[PDB]
Each structure stands twice: as structure tokens, then as C-alpha cells.
Curated annotation (Swiss-Prot), chain A:
The keyword Nucleus applies. It comes from Bos taurus. Belongs to the ARPC3 family. One of its GO terms (biological process) is Arp2/3 complex-mediated actin nucleation. It is found in: Cytoplasm, Cytoskeleton; Cell projection; Nucleus. This is Actin-related protein 2/3 complex subunit 3. GO terms for molecular function: actin binding.
From Swiss-Prot, chain B:
Keywords: Acetylation, ADP-ribosylation, ATP-binding, Cytoplasm, Cytoskeleton, Hydrolase, Methylation, Muscle protein, Nucleotide-binding, Oxidation. GO terms for molecular function: actin monomer binding; ATP binding; calcium ion binding; calcium-dependent protein binding; cytoskeletal motor activator activity; hydrolase activity; identical protein binding; magnesium ion binding. PROSITE patterns: ACTINS_1 (PS00406), ACTINS_2 (PS00432), ACTINS_ACT_LIKE (PS01132). It comes from Oryctolagus cuniculus. The lineage of its organism: Eukaryota, Metazoa, Chordata, Craniata, Vertebrata. The keyword Ion transport does not apply. This is Actin, alpha skeletal muscle.
UniProtKB/Swiss-Prot annotation, chain C:
The modification N6-acetyllysine is found at residues 224, 228, 235, 238. Keywords: Acetylation, Actin-binding, ATP-binding, Cell projection, Cilium biogenesis/degradation, Cytoplasm, Cytoskeleton, Nucleotide-binding, Nucleus. Its main location: cytoplasm. It comes from Bos taurus (Bovine). This is Actin-related protein 3. Belongs to the actin family. ARP3 subfamily. The gene is ACTR3. One of its GO terms (biological process) is Arp2/3 complex-mediated actin nucleation. Pfam families: Actin.
UniProtKB/Swiss-Prot annotation, chain D:
SMART domains: ACTIN (SM00268). This is Actin-related protein 2. ATP-binding component of the Arp2/3 complex, a multiprotein complex that mediates actin polymerization upon stimulation by nucleation-promoting factor (NPF). The Arp2/3 complex mediates the formation of branched actin networks in the cytoplasm, providing the force for cell motility. Seems to contact the pointed end of the daughter actin filament. In podocytes, required for the formation of lamellipodia downstream of AVIL and PLCE1 regulation. Component of the Arp2/3 complex composed of ACTR2/ARP2, ACTR3/ARP3, ARPC1B/p41-ARC, ARPC2/p34-ARC, ARPC3/p21-ARC, ARPC4/p20-ARC and ARPC5/p16-ARC. Interacts with AVIL. GO terms for biological process: Arp2/3 complex-mediated actin nucleation; positive regulation of double-strand break repair via homologous recombination; positive regulation of lamellipodium assembly; positive regulation of transcription by RNA polymerase II. Keywords: Acetylation, Actin-binding, ATP-binding, Cell projection, Cytoplasm, Cytoskeleton, Nucleotide-binding, Nucleus. The modification N6-acetyllysine is found at residues 285, 308. Belongs to the actin family. ARP2 subfamily. The gene is ACTR2. It comes from Bos taurus. InterPro entries: Actin, Actin/actin-like_CS, ATPase_NBD.
Amino acid sequence: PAYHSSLMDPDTKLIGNMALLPIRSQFKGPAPRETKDTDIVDEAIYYFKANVFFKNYEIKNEADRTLIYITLYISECLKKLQKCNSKSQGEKEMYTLGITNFPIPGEPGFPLNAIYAKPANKQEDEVMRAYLQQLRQETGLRLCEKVFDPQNDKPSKWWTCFVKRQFMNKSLSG
Amino acid sequence: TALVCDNGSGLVKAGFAGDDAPRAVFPSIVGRPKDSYVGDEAQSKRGILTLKYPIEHGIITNWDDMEKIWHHTFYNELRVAPEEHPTLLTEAPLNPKANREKMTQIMFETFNVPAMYVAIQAVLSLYASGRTTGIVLDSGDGVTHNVPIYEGYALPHAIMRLDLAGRDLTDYLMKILTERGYSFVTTAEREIVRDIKEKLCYVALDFENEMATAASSSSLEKSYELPDGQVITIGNERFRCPETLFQPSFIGMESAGIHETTYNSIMKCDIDIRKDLYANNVMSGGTTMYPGIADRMQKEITALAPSTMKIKIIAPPERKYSVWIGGSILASLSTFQQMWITKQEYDEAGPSIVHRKCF
Amino acid sequence: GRLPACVVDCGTGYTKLGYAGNTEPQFIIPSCIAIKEGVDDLDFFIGDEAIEKPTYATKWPIRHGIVEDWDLMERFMEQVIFKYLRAEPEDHYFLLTEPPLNTPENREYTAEIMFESFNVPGLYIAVQAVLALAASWTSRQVGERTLTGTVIDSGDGVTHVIPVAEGYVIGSCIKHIPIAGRDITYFIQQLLRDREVGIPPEQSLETAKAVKERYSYVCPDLVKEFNKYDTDGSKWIKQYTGINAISKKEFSIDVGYERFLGPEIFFHPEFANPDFTQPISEVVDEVIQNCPIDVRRPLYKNIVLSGGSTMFRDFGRRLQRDLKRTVDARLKLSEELSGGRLKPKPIDVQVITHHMQRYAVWFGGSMLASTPEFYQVCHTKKDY
Amino acid sequence: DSQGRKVVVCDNGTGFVKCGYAGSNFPEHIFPALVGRPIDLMVGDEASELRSMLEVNYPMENGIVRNWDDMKHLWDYTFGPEKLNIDTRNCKILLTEPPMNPTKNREKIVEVMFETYQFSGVYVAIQAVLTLYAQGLLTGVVVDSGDGVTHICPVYEGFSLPHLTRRLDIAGRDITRYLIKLLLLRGYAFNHSADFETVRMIKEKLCYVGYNIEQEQKLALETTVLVESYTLPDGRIIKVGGERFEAPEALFQPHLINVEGVGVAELLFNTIQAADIDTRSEFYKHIVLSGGSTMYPGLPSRLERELKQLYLERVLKGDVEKLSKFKIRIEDPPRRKHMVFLGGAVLADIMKDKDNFWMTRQEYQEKGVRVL
Ligand SMILES: Nc1ncnc2c1ncn2[C@@H]1O[C@H](COP(=O)(O)OP(=O)(O)OP(=O)(O)O)[C@@H](O)[C@H]1O
Ligand SMILES: Nc1ncnc2c1ncn2[C@@H]1O[C@H](COP(=O)(O)OP(=O)(O)OP(=O)(O)O)[C@@H](O)[C@H]1O
Ligand SMILES: Nc1ncnc2c1ncn2[C@@H]1O[C@H](COP(=O)(O)OP(=O)(O)O)[C@@H](O)[C@H]1O
Ligand SMILES: [Mg+2]
Ligand SMILES: [Mg+2]
Ligand SMILES: [Mg+2]
């Protein structure tokens, strides 16, 4: 019923219980880089429009913890990027949106923390904070093409109607 | 074209004289909530009908429902008028004498058949085998009998009766099946547990050796398709059900098996006819279909008879309907025309045939 | 049969009236009564003359499939008989319809209202399942006519799943899905009041109902349809033009993603009801597999659909595919449990759709009441 | 203990398990025999208040062990640190054995009890003997009912008579199932699985066997003093009327729920009129009722009438003078439910000291079987 994870390589890594996959990045970020184009970002956004209505969701896979994070951040990104007009100004707003110290799992203030692994180690915190920030920044470039329309340069009304929904009835911004 | 209408506790049979197979074989069961639901239609609407059996243990207990069964036999199954031609009927041995004519008077009072030759069930199975002298087992659904017949005569002082029959075996099979884990409950699920009995049961010589082989090596296992999509693997009851006939102590009855009573049948007889009666023991009935049941009898009797003579035990293939064919080969015969219980006797003597023509 | 019988079917959202022996009902009206709040008792209107009326309080006397007020149902039946049907009740037989799981009290009060007030010679109250299953034979092969099946009774209130075996209804194995058409239009209203501006508040329900009835269908998978909508918008996006209630100003809206998320809440009730999460593909399976063991196969082979909310395109296909998928795995598990020596016969699952699906109960009532022997079944006046 | 004052007796049933010590006239603890798993293991009383959110399983059926992986978990709960608190190494046990039990099951419980628990004394007792040991008699007839099947079994001095034992396949489970079907025809829908224990309280509280059916129907048709209101946990109020005296009458008329037979009253007659002539009077005077499914009001007072009428038109046809000399008596004390336990509370008290009643641990260390 619900759309579970995809692209689980056998030889991966599980810092916390995230799954580090290759991502086509162009801003910054220490990470393994990508040789193909079908990253988990473009795969996750393709699944976005059907998942917002699902209130119950099974934790099938480790890399499913990647889909619970991106899909929960695109909700906030659509919520913020509503009243802007210009594509360039909206792009600047999403670029500055990535520069924010959101609470990673493992500290109070992060909701839905019951299904997460606590990085008690001294080393996991910095890599988790780096990569979740990198992912939240990287989503903006690919969201810019689709949030606005190319013919008239306003937010399309089709995209700006999954704004009041919350995946599993609990959003990041408490 | 005489009608042979063989009654029975399990499945009533009806057909013409010239044929060699019963045309109408349907269950003898009557349902009540219309009231005239008997047979397959009674079985179909089991959710509303309180089914009940008219015939019990070979003696008619309820008489109205037996009349309903007879009415259904001559109207829907055959589609003929009652009085077109004579009708033959059969009743088990060791019956109340008045009950022979209690059905005659209710037959004439609603059908007025031209004639009757009401006879015993076991006297004609021996003719169907092809001889006039021998021992007969009526191993049926309600009762089992041992009946010797010499020159067409039934000796009333040399018969024996056993209560063990098919329904007790089916109940025992249900009880064994509950223990394995595949629970079968209520009377609706009877018709399927009978089905396991038909084609997944047999008899073995060494009852103990067969148990040892079954328990040790799991090669005596068989798969059965229930009509739900499920499959049941069945093991060690393939021989623990039919062995109840040879050892009735499993259910609890202290009576002897069907293998010692064939001895007591012929001990209670003359010296000079035993050489004739060992030579031809004839099986019959619906509850003697199992494979290898000839061999167990052939091994058991040889261990209990004198070793100075030969015991031959035989059985046709068509054992289930041997009562019907034996009727039809007797109803249609040359010199059979003159000795019926005809209608003019009852018309002339009035209600006096019920205590005169009892032969 | 000197005059035909009268058939009246009462529902939560609609009432259907007609005469025996006809294929179509002569009147499908809303079940609304409007009154004013001597002979002031008779000043009222029913049906289409009660949906909007200024100086009259309107209301609905049937809710959830039961009668809430009887003083209103009596008057409703008076103007059903004496205005639209134009039948004298003293020389006609009546074939009414009861909800599933009806109490004896509710069944007897209807007989009171009929016999004591209208002098009806004969009355027959019939269960909906057998009448729905009788109409299924109009579009079936000659070699298969049986009273065995499972009916998915949909509509405007609550959805029932009722199995019937050999003419009678098995009361224990009846289960209720709380989804129906009213929930679908409430859901599509909330969808439409987030994306489009131009809908007056008053005509929201009417526009939602119109969009539900005109353009609505089911899809195999949601992601492919969402991709197809954005990839090629000209083919799959249409326009709806409506007339305002004030000043006749025409307005236009675009029908988009609400086309195929409307009838999806049958198969995913968690989209719109948080207290229920079981898809309809499983309720039918669990109702079928709680019955006597000898009648499991014929019920799967005949799953008929009766009700207005099953009128969507390709509704039966999803039920068929899901039920085949969920029974094949069970047979595979049973086969692997017993090695591989014996392969069970695969269960054939089948769903039957007809031309007569919106008013199947009325059609069954018309066919039953036209037979000569129907007059030997009803309760006569002297019996009461 | 050293002097022998740590003998424990327990009655194991399909619906309820009743455990206690010897020398007491009451059970120490009663609890229902439910083990279930959610949709780790919830065993015992906790599987009663919540069962709609739990999948249940009954690990026994008339003494036959359905699964040999759940009885161990139930017996741990019985002989564990929540009910009895026994030090299992120093104890002796007295168990029940229902009539007509197969050999393999009898020597499997005895086999498993000496191995995985290390008791010091085991005995297994027939329930028919124990029921009369609690009544002071030695020869009699026990008509026991419950949640399995209704057994009628005679017993001569100390030893039962398995040849003359009869059984009838209806009990409390069939009656409480039939009550669901009857209540379904009033607008009240109770599902088979999750509401089994809600209708059981209705059966226990409001049901009774009628003496004369005629006055029951007259009061049911022309009077409203039989209808009673029952409150539910949800807060609804249902009304139960003439269904009170229809559900319990599957016992006397077994064909109402599709069971072929003769009923309890006639089956008792067919059992007493099947023994030798001399001992038939010894059984007429002493008939004892046991089990929880014989506590309906009026069930004592109906069997007497049925037996008197069945014995005045089958044996002594007509001639209504000699029935006064024919004495028939049924014993039924208000302690019917626990008569299996109380008998076990006596037999373990008399024979507490002499070391031949019990099966010693050392017997199975060498022999592995028993002859007592
Ligand atoms: N294509 C369609 N054609 C007709 N009605 C449709 C269609 N799609 C949905 N519907 C809905 O079907 C319902 C028709 O009502 P219907 O006559 O089936 O109910 P009812 O029998 O009165 O109700 P209930 O059985 O709950 O008492 C209306 O809600 C209508 O909106
Ligand atoms: N006062 C009462 N009235 C009616 N039914 C009752 C009453 N008290 C108990 N019951 C029913 O009697 C049954 C109790 O059976 P009991 O405790 O005697 O079991 P048991 O003898 O251990 O069972 P079994 O021999 O089947 O294993 C339950 O159905 C309970 O509902
Ligand atoms: N193929 C079979 N194999 C074994 N037993 C059978 C078979 N067919 C029927 N039976 C048993 O035989 C019974 C029918 O016996 P039947 O010959 O009708 O007795 P009667 O004719 O005296 O009533 C059935 O109840 C069934 O248990
Ligand atoms: Mg026969
Ligand atoms: Mg309808
Ligand atoms: Mg007990």
C-alpha cells in the first residue's frame, strides 16, 4: 500500500540509521560522489505527491529513513516558498533556507524520534549535521524547476495545494 | 418391467427390471422447516431444515416419513404411475412380523400396486453372486448381519446381528482426526470426512507391524484436496479406522469382530453342509469396498478352521449394488408369474391377507 | 393481476417509486420533507419541491438507514401514494424494502402505518440482498442462475457486505465499511477548496456532486497517473462551466488531481477516515472466509455490485485483481506447507457488472411482484 | 514437606483452571485457561478483559492437549510467582483424568511432569470417583457437564465402569453460541470471536430452565415480566426477553442446534436401564450433578419429572400405585462447580502419609512405567 524504499546497495553504511547514497552535488559537502543521475533526491520527489496522504508507514528498510526525511522537508519547503514571485528570488530564498541549524535526530525538539538511532558517539553528530544540511540544500535546486512554471514565472497552483498536509500527521517544525 | 425398490438406512435405490444398474440412488433422509423436502434438496438447504432419518438400524421407526420417501420415489425419481405394473420390495431379516404387512396395508391404501413379492435382503445377494447356497454378510450402513442360506431358505435360528456399521466408523474417523490438529466440527462437515473414508482407507494384515512401519518411516502419508483450496496430509488413520470391524473394543463395544462371527454362523449348523458352506462365503453391502479385505478374512479364518480342508472366499466387483441386481434378475423370470402376492387375493379375501399369506 | 403492484424503495438520499412490471422507476426523488414552522397538517411538500423553498423548514426523515421520525414518514407516504403514483391503496399490493439488520419493532411500525391508515390489502417487506442478486441474471449466461453470492451494497449511508447462500441471508457474516458517497463528496470538497478560487460558498456541494458524477474514475497506480498529468496536461485536464445563483455570472474551473483521488478512499480509507484502515479488498475476503466450508467457492464466483457508488469506471477490476492477488498467495502458502506433491485447484474470482446497477433493488422488486404466485406470499388484512 | 503438608491439587479444564491445597473446602485460585498472542505472550487473567486486541487459543479439549507448547506456559503461570509461589522441587501433585482418555496422552503428561519440573510425587485420578468421594458415597452415577461434552458415567465401589459410559455433544459453549444466534434476531449484532465473553455474562446472569413450558409461553405472550435490561461496557442497554428459557433447552431437546441424539433426561434413562438388574436400584437413589453447566435454575427440578414420566410409560406402563414404592432421588448441593476439586481435597488428606499412593520419582529412573 505505502511506497517503501528503493536502491539499497548491499555495501552501504549506517551512521545512526541513515543510508549514505551517492548524490549529484554541486554546492559543497564531504561525501562519496555520483557517477549516474537517478539520485535518491529525484527518486524521492517523484514519489512525493502520493505519499503525503499516508498516515501509517512501515519501516521496511534502513534507507527508508532517507525517504522519511526528504519527504518531510519538502513539505516545509513548499510551505515557505508560497508568497515569492520571481524564480531567481525564490532560488535565493531556498539557497538561504539551507543555511539553518535544524535539530537532527538525537536531541530534544526533533519530532517522531522514536524510530531513530541516537548518535551518542562523538563522531556521528558532525557528519549527520553536515549531510542533512547538504541534502536540505540540494533539494532546492531540483525543486526550483518544478515549484514555479517556465511560461509565466509564478508558483503553479497544482504544486501549491499540498501545503496543509503533514506526512504521518507530524511535521519537522513543531 | 418390474420395479425393484431396495430400501436401506443410508441410500435408497430404485429402478426397472431389465436394466443392470440402479437408475435412482438417492439418500433416505427427510427434512422439516415446504414440508416435502426429501433427498438432495433437503441436503442443500441445511441452514433451515432439521434433518432426520426415517429408517434406523434396518427397522422402520417413523412411518409417515417412510411414506413420504415412497411417494418421492414413485413421482420424481421414476416419473411413472404407481399401478402400471408390479413392485418388489425388500426388508432385513430379524424384523417384527407385523411390520412386514404394516407397509403392505399403507401401500394398498395409497397406491394399490398389482402385486408384491416382499422378501429378505440377503436371500437374493447369493443369487446375484450366481449360486443358491452360502453365507452372506449384509455389512451395510445401519446394521451388519451374518446370514446362512441353503437352497434358497433363510434359517432363522442361525443368524447373528452386529450394531457396527458405516456411521460408527465415520464418527470414529472424526474422533481420530480431531487429535492430529485438523479439527472437524458439527454435522455440516460430515460429508467431507466421509470422502476421506472412501478413497484413503485400507486394511493391513500385521496390525502391529503396520503401525510400526507407519510410525517409523513416513512413507504412508497422503495428500487430500479439501474443497476450500487447503491440502491435508494424512498419516496413520488410513488403517486405524477400518480395523474397528475386527476389534470393536476401540469404540467400546464388547461384541466380537466380523471375523469370529463368521465362525459362529457355521458352528450353529449341520455337520454335512459345512463342506458346502466354507467353499462359498459371499460378501455384499456398501461397507466392504476397502482394498485387501478379502485377504484379512482369508488369513484369519484359516487360523481358526480345521487345517484338513479348503476355504475359498470370493467377492464380485459390483458389491455395492448387488442387492439391486439380485432383485432384478429374480423379478423377471419365466415361472415367476404365478406365485406373487397379487391384488385379487386382497380383493377377494378383504383385509385378511395380512395374517394368511405370510410365506 | 387485474392491476399491478406498487414498489417503493426508501433510502437515506433518494426514494424510488413505481409500478410492477416496468424496467425503469417512474420517479427518483430526494427523500426530503418541508413543512411550515385545522388542516395545517397537510401543508407540506416532498422531493424536488422541498430542496429550496423560502418559508419552509426542510429535513431528512431517514438517516444512516433507519427511521428517526415516523410522523414525517407517514406524510411522506401519503403524498407518495396520492400525488405521484396516483393509486388508491385499497386495491393494490405493496412491496416495501427494509435495511439489513432491521429490528422487529421497526418492521412492525411500518405495517401499522400501512394497514391501520391506508387499508392496504397486502404488504411484503423484502430483504435487499436477494432482490439485488435476482437482477444480476439480466446480463449473465443461461447456464448459470443461482441464488448464491455476495452483495456489496453501496450508496449514500454505510456500505454493507452481505453473503447469501441458497436463497437466505447469513446474518452473522455481515460487516460494515463506514465509507459511502457522502464521504467522497465531503473529501472532494476539501480538495477543491484548496486550489481553485471562483466557487461561491453556497454552491460548493452542488459543484462537488457534479464533478463527482461527470468526471471520476479509478486508476491502477497513483504515481504513474500523477506523472502523466504533469507530463501531458492537455489530454487529462478538462474544464467545468457553472452558473452562479446571483446575477447569472458564469464561472469556470479546471478538473485536475481530484478526478482519481475521489473514488480511491474505498481502497484506502485512511485518506479520509482516521479510525478505519482496512481496504475493501480484505473485508470481502474475511467475510467470505467465515462461512460454512462447503459454500466458499460459489461465493467467490459471484460477487455482484448494487448501489449508486459502485457506478465508477473500472471499479470491479480493482476488486478482482486484489482478491486474486490475496487468494493466490494463500494457496501458495498452503501448497508449500505440504511439500510439492499436490497442487490445489486455483479459485476463480469474478465480479459482475450490469446495465442495471443504480436501481437494482427496485428492478428485483418489479420482477418478483409480476409473477402470478407472488399474491400467495403476502400478509393479508385479516392476518393483522 | 517432611511431614507431608505441601500437597497441591489442581483441576485442569477447557474453560477454567482451579488450583489449591488439600484440607481446604474452597479452591485457592480460579482462573480462565486462555493463552494468546497480539495481532509477548499474554497468559491467564490478562487474556480476559482485553481480547478484541488479542488473538486467543484454547490449549485443551476434553482432556486432549491441542498444542504441547502452550500448556507449559500456562503451568508456569499456575506454579509460578504470581498465584501459588511453590518451591517446585518439594511437592506432590494430584491430577484429574476425564473419562475415556487415550493411553498416549495419559503417559505423556506423567512423562513431561517428572522431567521439566522435578516434582516428587504424582497421581492421576478419575473424576467420577472424586465426585462421589466428596459426597460420602462409593457407588453412584455422575452426570458431569461444563464446556466440553456432557458425560454420564456410573461407578461401583472405587472403580469406574468404562463399558457403560455415555456422552452427549453439547455443553456451555454450544448454549452460549446459540444465544448469539437468538439475540441476532432482535437487532443486536455480536460477532463470533471478540464478543464471546460478553454474551457469557448474559448467559450466567439471566437464563433458566422452565418447569412447565406452557406457563412460560403464557407469561411470555400475555405478560411483560420476563424482559430484563442488560448494560454493556460500551454504555448501550439491550433487552433480553423470551430468549432466557430457549437457550438452555438444547440440553433436553438436542435437535434445535443440529445434534442427533436423545437429550440428557433420556440418555440418563438409557444408561441406568443398561446394567444388571440387581444394581439398578443402587443407581436410582444416588445421582449426583457436577460441573458448572448444571447451575441453571430449575435443572434439578426438571430431571426428576422427566425420569418419573419416562419410567411410568416405558417400564411400568400404567398402574399408578407402585411409583410410591419406587424411590428416585437426585443430589445437587449448592457447591456443584468445584466437586472435582473438593474430592481431590479429601483423597490427598487421607492418604498424605503412606508412600504407595504416589508415583515415586525413582520409579521412572529405572522402570519408566506404572501399574498403580
Ligand atoms: N455515476 C453516478 N451516477 C449516479 N449516482 C452516483 C454516481 N456516482 C456517485 N453517485 C452517488 O450515488 C448515490 C445514489 O444514491 P443511492 O440511490 O444509491 O442511495 P440509497 O439507496 O438512497 O442509500 P442507502 O442505501 O445508503 O440508504 C448518490 O449519492 C450519488 O451522489
Ligand atoms: N450459574 C451459571 N449459570 C449458567 N452457566 C454457568 C454458571 N456458572 C458457570 N456457567 C458456565 O459453565 C461453564 C463452566 O464450566 P466448568 O468451570 O465447570 O468447566 P470444566 O468442568 O473445567 O470444563 P471441561 O470438563 O469442559 O474441561 C462456563 O460455560 C460458564 O459460563
Ligand atoms: N466407496 C466406498 N468405500 C467405502 N465405504 C463406502 C463407499 N461408499 C459408501 N460407503 C459406505 O457405505 C454406506 C452405504 O451403505 P449401504 O450399502 O447403503 O447400506 P444399506 O444399503 O444397507 O443402507 C455409506 O454410509 C458409507 O459409509
Ligand atoms: Mg444395504
Ligand atoms: Mg440501495
Ligand atoms: Mg471439569
